[PDB]
Design a protein around this ligand. Structure first.
Ligand code: HEM
Ligand code: HEM
Ligand code: HEM
Ligand code: HEM
Ligand SMILES: [Mg+2]
Ligand SMILES: [Mg+2]
Ligand SMILES: [Mg+2]
Ligand SMILES: [Mg+2]
Lengths: 222, 223, 222, 223
C-alpha cells in the first residue's frame, strides 16, 4: 500500500490511527484541513466505520480547532493537553513529562507487557489500560482524569482491538496492534483487511462498558 | 489425605504452609514447628533443597514473639511487617482487614493478570506489579521496604516454580487457583512434586527475572 | 495436525526436531527403536530432507546406542553428555548445570535475544551461537567443545534456519523457530510447509561454512 | 565545517569528542578544554542539557594528570582505567594495543550485532554484551569494575539516543557507523541534533534499560 512518512511541513497528532491514515493518504498527507466529508469517507474507506460514528468523532475533533465553531481540524490541533488528549495514554508520555503527541517506546513497553499472548483479548486490553492509569496516578503530580477522559480511554482501547481485529470475537492479533503503533502504517503486510461489518456507535458503547467491567481499578477511581 | 482446619488449628498468611498443615506434612494444628519438621515437610511434599528449607525456617522463627525460639506456629507468621507484608496476591492489607485469611476479592484482581491456561513469568510479574500499585494507591499506611519487595518476589517465584516448572518457568493456572482457593495440593489435577529440587541459587536468580519483567515506577522500592 | 505430548513411558532427547517428529507420530510416539527406514522416511515425509543426509544423521544417532554396532536408536540415547550432545546448546542447559535434554526457558531467553528481527538471517543465527559458546566458556568450569562438537553446533544452527525456513534465502521467520523449540510441534498453524527442494548434505556443509564465517569468536576458539 | 586532525592535534578514545574537535565545536587541536567550552560544544552540536554537560566535564577533568585542574585535553581521556576501559566497541583493550584510536577489526565485531538498518536497544545491548564477553575471554588483564560497567552503559545509550531518538530508543545504523568510522557528524545522511535536550535523569533511566536487555553471566560485574 502507498505510504509516506511525514515531512517538515506535515503535521501529526496523538492518535496513532489518524496519523496512519494521513501517512497512507486516506487523510491529507500533510495532516491539515480535514473536513467532515474527508473524515467520514476516510474512516469508511480505510476501516469500514459506520458514518454516524465517524461523523461524531469529527464533531469531537473540531472542538480542538482554536477557531470557534470550526467545521474542520488539523492533526496537531488534537494534541493540546486535556481537551481530547489525556494522561495515561498507552504509547505517549503524559504532558507533564514530555510532549504528549509522539510515540514513546518506553511507555509502549509498559502497555505491551500486559498483552500476554499472540492474541489480545478484552481482559488483556483492560489490564493494560488499568496499568497505565495507575502508573500515571502514582508518578504524575499533575495527573488528571475527568469523566470524559476516562470515557475517551475506554473508547480508544475498544478501537484498537475491534477496528484492527474483530468486534465479533473481541480479539486482535498482537502483531497488528504493535505494527500500527510502532510504524503508523496499517498492518496490511501481516494480513490485515478492514472489517466486513461496519462498527457502529452502539457497538462501541457496549464494548466500552465491557472493558470497564474487566478493569481492576481502585473504587475511588473516576 | 487432607483435613480441613478446625477452630483449634492455627493457620497463617502462607497458602502453602497452610496447605501442608491441612495434609499433615506439618502438624495439623499448625503449632510448635521445629526445623526438622519444616525440612521434612518441604522435602517430602515439594522436594525443595534442604538448605533452602532450613533458611526458610530461620526466617519463620523470627516471627515467634519468644526470644531465642527455635520453633514457630503458623499464626506467628501473620504478624504484620515481620515476614507478612502489604500487596499480597490473595490477602487484604492489614490496614483494611486481617492479613492472614484468603480474600476472594483481592484474589480476583490477581487472577485477572493470569491471562491463559498457563501462567508465565510475565503474567506473574504483571499480577505482582498490579497488586503493588493498587496497595500504593489505596492504603494510606502502605509500606514496602526493600526487604518486603524481595519477599514478594520470592513468593511469586515460589507459586510458579514449586507448583509448576522451574525449567520452563511456567505453571498451569488451575494448579495455582486450586492451591490458593482450597489450601489443598492439586493432586487431583495431576500435580506431582518436582524431580529436580529447587535450590536457593535458582530461587534468587528467578527473583531477579520476575523483577526484570515488572513495570513499576522507576522510583518504586527495589528489592 | 495430529500431535500428542509424551507420556510417562515415552522417551525424548536433546533434539527439538526429533522430539517434535515423535510428538506428531512421524517417528514412533514413544521415541524408541528408531530404525534406518523409519528415520529416512520420517525426515523425508515431514521435512523433505534428502535420503543421504537422513541416512548419515541416522549413522551418527546409532553411535549413542550402548549396544555395539546397533542399527537403531532411541531418543534418550541421544542425551548422553559429550557423545553427540554438547555444551553451548541454544535451548538446553550444559550438563554441568542441569540435565542437558529438556527445554530450558532461561537458556532460550539468551538465544532469542540475538534474533533481533521478525526474520532470522544467518548473521543473527551466527551471533546467537557465538553468544552461547562464549557464555558456556565463561561460566562452565567443565566446558568442552571438540572439533566435532563445534561442527555439530554449526549444523544444528543451519538446520533450524533452513529446514524451518529457506535454504534459498538463508532466512526463517522467528516465530517458526520459537514455536518449534517452545512447543516441540511443527509450526503448521503459523503457515509452515516443508521445503519443495530437498536439503542435501552438500548444501548443509556449504551453509555450515557460511555461519562459521559470520561468527565473531576469539581466535583461540575451536 | 570539518577538518582532519594534524599531527599536533590531540585526540582521545571518545568518538564524539574527537568529532566535535574536528568540527571546531571543541578546539581543533584538542587541548585546554574548560567547562564553558565543553558545555557550549555539547549544547551547540548535540543539544545536551547543560547539567549533564557540566557533569561530563567534571568526569573529564579527573583524567588530567595535574591536581586541581579545571580543564582537560583529549589525550588525557585515553589514560587506561580512569574513564577509558576495556571492552570498547571500536578500540582495542590497552593490553593488546593503544586504546585511543579507532580499530576496524574491533568495530567489525560490534557491527555484527547491529542487524538491521535501524539499531534498537536490544541490538545495542547485544553488541556491548558480546564485547564484554570477548574481552573477558581473551584479555588476561581484563578489568571491569562496577564503575567501568556503568561507563559502558552510558556510552551505549549515548550513541543511540544522541545520534538518534530517545523517544523511540533507536538510531539509523548508518549514522552510527559514519560517526565512528569518520569522526564526523552524519549531517550529509540527514542528521539534525535532537529538539528535546537529553537530561541526566533520562540517560540514567536508559542505562538501566540497556542493562536489563543484556545477557551476561549472573556473576558478571553489575553497574
Ligand atoms: C476522527 C476520528 C478520531 C479522532 C478525532 C481521534 C482522536 C484521538 C485523540 C485526540 C487521541 C489522544 C488521546 C490520548 O491518548 O491522550 C487518540 C488516541 C487514540 N486513538 Fe484516536 N481518533 C480518531 C480515530 C481513531 C480510530 C479510527 C482508531 C482505531 C484504531 C483510533 C485509535 C486510537 C487509539 C488506540 C488511541 C490511544 C493512543 C494511546 O493511548 O497511546 N482513533 N485519538
Ligand atoms: C518455611 C517455609 C515458608 C515460610 C516461613 C513462608 C512464609 C510466608 C509468609 C509469612 C507469607 C505472607 C507474605 C504476604 O503475602 O504478606 C507467605 C506468602 C506466600 N507463600 Fe510462603 N512461606 C513458606 C513456604 C512457601 C512455599 C514452599 C511456597 C510454595 C508455593 C509458598 C508460597 C507462598 C505464596 C505464593 C505467598 C503469597 C500469598 C499472597 O500473596 O497472597 N510459601 N509465605
Ligand atoms: C536423525 C536425525 C537427527 C539427529 C540424530 C539429531 C541429533 C541431535 C542431538 C544429539 C542434538 C543435541 C546437541 C546439543 O544441543 O547438545 C540435537 C540438537 C539440535 N537439533 Fe537435531 N538431530 C536430528 C535431526 C534434526 C533436524 C532434522 C533438525 C531440523 C530443525 C534438527 C535441529 C536441531 C537443532 C536446532 C538442535 C540444537 C538444540 C539446541 O541447541 O538447543 N535436528 N540434534
Ligand atoms: C565531556 C563529554 C564526554 C567525555 C568526557 C567522554 C569520555 C569518553 C571516554 C573517556 C571514552 C572511552 C571509554 C572507552 O570506550 O574505553 C568514551 C567513549 C565513548 N563515547 Fe564519550 N565522552 C563524552 C561525550 C560523549 C558524547 C556526547 C557522546 C555521544 C555520542 C559520546 C559517545 C561515546 C561512545 C559511543 C563511546 C564508546 C566508544 C567505544 O566503545 O569504542 N561521548 N567517551
Ligand atoms: Mg495522552
Ligand atoms: Mg500480606
Ligand atoms: Mg547440549
Ligand atoms: Mg576502551
Amino acid at each position: 500500500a502507498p505510504w509516506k512518512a511525514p515531512g517538515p511541513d506535515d503535521v501529526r497528532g496523538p492518535c496513532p490511527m489518524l496519523n496512519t491514515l494521513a501517512n497512507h493518504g486516506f487523510l491529507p498527507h500533510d495532516g491539515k484541513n480535514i473536513d467532515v466529508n474527508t473524515t467520514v469517507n476516510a474512516l469508511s474507506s480505510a476501516l469500514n466505520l459506520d458514518d454516524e460514528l465517524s461523523r461524531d468523532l469529527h464533531t469531537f475533533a473540531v472542538t480542538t480547532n482554536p477557531q470557534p465553531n470550526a467545521t474542520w481540524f488539523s492533526l496537531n490541533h488534537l494534541s493540546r493537553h486535556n481537551v481530547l488528549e489525556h494522561d495515561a495514554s498507552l504509547s505517549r508520555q503524559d504532558a507533564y513529562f514530555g510532549p504528549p503527541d509522539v510515540f514513546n517506546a518506553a511507555v509502549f513497553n509498559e502497555t505491551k507487557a500486559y498483552w500476554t499472548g499472540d492474541i489480545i483479548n478484552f481482559q488483556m486490553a483492560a489490564n493494560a489500560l488499568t496499568a497505565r492509569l495507575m502508573t500515571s496516578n502514582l508518578t504524575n503530580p499533575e495527573f488528571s482524569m475527568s469523566q470524559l477522559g476516562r470515557g475517551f480511554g475506554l473508547g480508544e482501547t475498544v478501537c484498537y482491538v475491534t477496528i484492527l481485529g474483530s468486534k465479533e470475537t473481541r480479539t486482535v492479533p498482537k502483531a497488528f496492534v504493535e505494527y500500527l503503533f510502532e510504524n503508523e502504517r496499517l498492518p496490511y503486510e501481516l494480513g490485515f483487511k478492514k472489517m466486513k461489518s461496519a462498527l457502529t456507535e452502539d457497538e462501541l458503547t457496549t464494548m466500552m462498558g465491557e472493558i470497564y467491567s474487566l478493569q481492576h481499578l481502585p473504587e475511588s477511581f473516576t
